[PDB]
Amino acid sequence: NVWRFPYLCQSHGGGAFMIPFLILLVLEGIPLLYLEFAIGQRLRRGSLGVWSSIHPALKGLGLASMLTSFMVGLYYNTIISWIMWYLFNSFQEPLPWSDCPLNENQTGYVDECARSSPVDYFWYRETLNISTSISDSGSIQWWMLLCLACAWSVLYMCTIRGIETTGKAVYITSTLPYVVLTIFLIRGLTLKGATNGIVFLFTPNVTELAQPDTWLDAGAQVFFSFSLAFGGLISFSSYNSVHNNCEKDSVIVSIINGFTSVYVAIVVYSVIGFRATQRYDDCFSTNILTLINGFDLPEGNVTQENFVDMQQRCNASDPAAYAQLVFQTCDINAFLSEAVEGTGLAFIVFTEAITKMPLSPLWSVLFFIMLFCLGLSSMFGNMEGVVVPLQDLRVIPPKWPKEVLTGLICLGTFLIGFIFTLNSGQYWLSLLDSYAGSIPLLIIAFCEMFSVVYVYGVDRFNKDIEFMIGHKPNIFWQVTWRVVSPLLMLIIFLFFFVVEVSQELTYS
Amino acid sequence: KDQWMKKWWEMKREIVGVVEPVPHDETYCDPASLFHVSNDYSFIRYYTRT
Amino acid sequence: VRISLKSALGDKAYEWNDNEMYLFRSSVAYAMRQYFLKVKNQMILFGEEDVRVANLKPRISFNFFVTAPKNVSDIIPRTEVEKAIRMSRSRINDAFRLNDNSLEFLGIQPTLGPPNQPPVSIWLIVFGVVMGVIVVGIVILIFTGIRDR
Amino acid sequence: VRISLKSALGDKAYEWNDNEMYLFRSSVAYAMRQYFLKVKNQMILFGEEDVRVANLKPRISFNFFVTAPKNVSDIIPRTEVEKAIRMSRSRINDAFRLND
Ligand SMILES: *[C@@H]1O[C@H](CO)[C@@H](O[C@@H]2O[C@H](CO)[C@@H](O)[C@H](O)[C@H]2NC(C)=O)[C@H](O)[C@H]1NC(C)=O
Ligand SMILES: *[C@@H]1O[C@H](CO)[C@@H](O[C@@H]2O[C@H](CO)[C@@H](O)[C@H](O)[C@H]2NC(C)=O)[C@H](O)[C@H]1NC(C)=O
Ligand SMILES: *[C@@H]1O[C@H](CO)[C@@H](O[C@@H]2O[C@H](CO)[C@@H](O)[C@H](O)[C@H]2NC(C)=O)[C@H](O)[C@H]1NC(C)=O
Ligand SMILES: *[C@@H]1O[C@H](CO)[C@@H](O)[C@H](O)[C@H]1NC(C)=O
Ligand SMILES: *[C@@H]1O[C@H](CO)[C@@H](O)[C@H](O)[C@H]1NC(C)=O
Ligand SMILES: *[C@@H]1O[C@H](CO)[C@@H](O)[C@H](O)[C@H]1NC(C)=O
Ligand SMILES: *[C@@H]1O[C@H](CO)[C@@H](O)[C@H](O)[C@H]1NC(C)=O
Ligand code: MET
Secondary structure: OOOOHHHHHHOOOOOOOOHHHHHHHHHHHHHHHHHHHHHHHHOOOOOOOOOOOOOHHHOOHHHHHHHHHHHHHHHHHHHHHHHHHHHHOOOOOOOHHHOOOEOOOOOOEOHHHHOOOOOHHHHHHHHOOOOOOOOOOOOOOHHHHHHHHHHHHHHHHHOOOOOOOHHHHHHHHOOOHHHHHHHHHHHHHOOOOOOOOOOOOOOOOOOOOOOHHHHHHHHHHHHHHOOOOOOOHHHHOOOOOOOOOHHHHHHHHHHHHOOOOHHHHHHHHHHHHHHHHHHHHHHHHHHHHHHHHHHOOOHHHOOOOOHHHHHHHHHOOOHHHHOOOOOOOOOOOOOOOOOOOOOOOOOOOOOOOOOOOOOHHHHHHHHHHHHHHHHHHHHHHHHHHHHHHHHOOOOOOOOOOHHHHHHHHHHHHHHHOOOOOOOOOHHHHHHHHHHHHHHHHHHHHHHHHHHHHHOOOHHHHHHHHHHHHOOOOOHHHHHHHHHHHHHHHHHHHHHHHOOOOOOOOOOO | OOOHHHHHHHHHHHHHOOOOOOOOOOOOOOHHHOHHHHOOOOOOHHHHHO | OEEOHHHHOOOOOOOOOHHHHHHHHHHHHHHHHHHHHHOOOOOOOOOHHHEEEEOOOOOOEOEEEEEOOOOOOOEOOHHHHHHHHHHHHHHHHHHHOOOOOOEEOOOOOOOOOOOOOOOOOOHHHHHHHHHHHHHHHHHHHHHHHHHOO | OEOOHHHHOOOOOOOOOHHHHHHHHHHHHHHHHHHHHHOOOOOOOOOHHHEEEEOOOOOOEOEEEEEOOOOOOOEOOHHHHHHHHHHHHHHHHHHHOOOO
16 A cells, blocks of 8 residues: 555556546455455354365365465565665664765765765665666675565564464554554645645546556455455454354455555655655756856846746847757656656655655654554464465374474575575566566455355355344345456456557566 | 946957956046046047048 | 855845955955965965956856966966865855855865765664564563473 | 954864964954945945054954054044944854854
8 A cells, every 4th residue: 555556556647546446446345355254254264174165176266375375475575674674774863865975086976876866876776786687686685684584583473373472463563553654644744745746646537547457457456455365364254253243344444444545645645746846846946047057147036937038038138148058847747757666666755755854863763663564464464374274284294383384484485585685686576566466366356256156155145144143234245246246357357368468568 | 437447348349359458347447547538638530530 | 256145045145245345355365375375385465456356247256366466467377276265165155154055166166075974884783683682582482382381 | 352262163273373363354344344334324445454453462362453544543433343343243253163
């Protein structure tokens, strides 16, 4: 909601990714979620023992879910690694990414720190040390092995025993972001460039939501904002007592997340707009300066409103001296839709607008602890969803404790996680992110949404939930389970298949 | 009366083709150091006669 | 020279009349006097009438050059005036409350200042303390279990 | 006048040679020029040779007085020099990095 949402919004303009997202939310995020909660409570087993009881040839879902929850967690942890690497570089009064370092010959800045921002020569050359091409990979970059080890150690120190040890970490690290986020919202809306970005978010380019790309992106994002088809919520809803009102919880969670999805878009665009209007004022000041340095006008006569007339008032006085100055061009609504991509949206925008506020060595630490304790929970759930189906497969002799299996999984994934710490490291991450977040999620979701209502019978499930909570579900759940949900899925599927051919595969 | 020397040296450069070797602010009067302008004599008679 | 008063002072910006030109010429004479005493060990009495000024403009710019005390045909070469100014720039700035970007000298650009902040690479000790707390948590929580069994 | 360099600057305290006396006399001439233009609306060209200085000492103290531009027998009364200095004190301080 902070790292993939605004990018997938900006690439599609910014206004065409809020109407489709919400329609797909209200139409698919809620019913499938309620379905999977209800099953997790009825069948009384984990994420694999369920799909192995319904027509036992359907045990594949118990393996596709495990494999995909592993492939996601493979890099959703190195992102946490980068975040805590940034968090370590705070605790110093002059922020490291606020100045360019000088070369061996102390006369000017290093080349690439001068031709670009001072904050891009901390993410692209000091943190990652990116090489020119994906086919070119070099050393191991120890100073990110340190952060990888620290991340995979914090995680294993928090989930040592499944439940009874995620309890307290959930008490702490699932309420902290909901106050730091408000603290940042209050600071964001009172900035200089607010109300110029959050109004850009809500203007729909009507001829953009008529392309299959935006629909496919909304479809693949509404299943990733939740954790449907990951196999994590089945297991969590397979513990509590039987006569529990499975509905209420479902609905409230569905409406507590889809609300915090437009409550983070507001805070992020309230900073993107600020940065854009700042760069715009800088371009305009540079133009004014290039004019007066060239014609010797007083200081306060060329201001932001009488500029065009004053520029016409010189060309008619020194025509040979005027046609030499190289003017810039800069208009708003062109600085907003700029080159902003994931892995570089929460590290290139928020880290340069965090150093232009008083007492920055506090706002930076608060923001990055928010991001860390916002991303840790997710990994809690994912590690539960990968550990549960393993010991339900009799892969380890049952006489061994649970700590040994959690430790083995952590060590294995850490040792595989050396692929993202090379020089050419950000490209591998971009690739895996794109494809493993896009394609398998929606096919698993459709397969389970079909299996539950057409292999288990919908009427059996109906009277089952009736006995559980105490009332048949309203007509809404019926219509959205029987026809609309699978039909929507098919559409998303074909759109993905029509958005893969005829679109070139390029990276930056 | 605060552009006397400015105009004197602008005209000198533009139409005579002669530049001053040291800049002269408004505390000078370079034309008044001529016999004819400090003693109140008309000067056009030297043009037309020629 | 090019001077920008509204940028630096913003408000409280005094007005640039002729007495400011007097003060500027005196500051340049002082800088020259300082340079020909701490480098070349002469003792030359530059005055504010040895600093000639040309092309005054509203933007608050102009040109100047310096001559030996009583010899109008003796121009100090430009590569020495540049060094004298490099040497006394910080006092010439202070006399006017300008700050080295509102008092540019057009061919003399500033560089003074070393960027040698970090003695310790502070992120290392923060990583050390977090590693210590995480390892101590790991052992205490894996020993809680063996105690409870 | 009494000047204390080691107190204010502490370190980095420049040395008070004769060029500093030149700069001080120029600052006082500027202050006088300012006062006889923003109060009395004259235009008088005080120079640094109109500021006479007596009794220099190591403590960095001395006396001074001001005379009209080319008239050695025309001393500006002290109650006007005091007002001109009251008016331009903050710039005279800045030229030297002293702090009142
Ligand atoms: C609104 O969306 C439309 C797409 O429907 C954009 O139109 C495209 O603009 C790009 C500009 O780089 C062209 O290369 C495409 O050929 C255009 N496609 C069509 C179908 O016109 C339009 O640019 C968007 N609005 C703005 C302001 O950019
Ligand atoms: C004024 O300066 C000029 C040069 O700037 C001095 O001229 C020099 O005079 C000596 C002897 O007359 C010659 O050998 C040099 O060649 C001259 N210099 C140049 C550049 O031609 C002149 O001496 C100075 N005035 C006084 C009084 O010393
Ligand atoms: C120099 O200053 C003195 C006073 O400081 C001026 O003397 C005055 O002269 C006029 C006419 O000569 C007398 O009426 C005044 O009484 C004089 N003043 C005093 C205090 O006696 C003198 O005029 C000034 N010099 C010039 C050239 O004007
Ligand atoms: C800096 O100076 C050294 C020695 O003077 C020189 O070898 C080096 O090339 C200079 N730096 C650059 C970028 O040229
Ligand atoms: C960054 O990578 C380059 C390879 O292009 C390598 O030469 C350099 O040593 C790396 N940076 C550091 C600080 O080692
Ligand atoms: C700026 O200067 C021009 C010419 O001196 C003048 O016409 C104009 O009015 C000035 N600006 C303002 C705001 O008065
Ligand atoms: C300046 O004026 C000339 C006419 O003298 C015209 O040809 C030219 O296009 C003008 N330039 C601009 C930028 O308006
Ligand atoms: C292992 S799930 C990764 C993150 C989490 N599922 C989310 O949607 O935020």
